[PDB]
Amino acid sequence: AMDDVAPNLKALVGAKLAARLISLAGGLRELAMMPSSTIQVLGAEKALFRHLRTGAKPPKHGVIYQYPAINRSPWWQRGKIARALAGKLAIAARVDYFSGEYIAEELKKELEARIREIKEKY
């Protein structure tokens, strides 16, 4: 049993999003020090920039956009899933930096359950 050891972000979202969130926070310490309501908009790029400089439309999502329930679903669900996903990611990044202990099937079950709740709602 002491051979099956792994990081959580690789299981909850996988490398295409995990290594992007690390690179857009500059590092994994910095991603673990970030709030859900900034992890939502990491890699929104030109959309975050002009929401500041010109006071434009707030970015609904950043590099999280290609998640398994955002770029492929109705607009009603796209906004609600983005911040819930960023919540569960803000937990997962703090786990993988500060302790490195594995819980990611429960972090998956909670994000199945909150998206099933978004389904009974919408």
Added chain:
RNA sequence: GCGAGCAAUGAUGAGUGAUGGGCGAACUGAGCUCGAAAGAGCAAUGAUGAGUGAUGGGCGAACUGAGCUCGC
């Protein structure tokens, strides 16, 4: 105060602006959804709001063309 020089065969005005890429001034911060309705489930370990692309109606918008200069 009055005259003098230049000018439609071109007097006047302006040291200031363009195009492209990030960051900073404490994102919202609790509601939502189902139900005859009390109620029930989800939620600060993040509810909700803030998307991109396209379709239709409405609203508004800015070079001049003669003045410039002076001696006592």
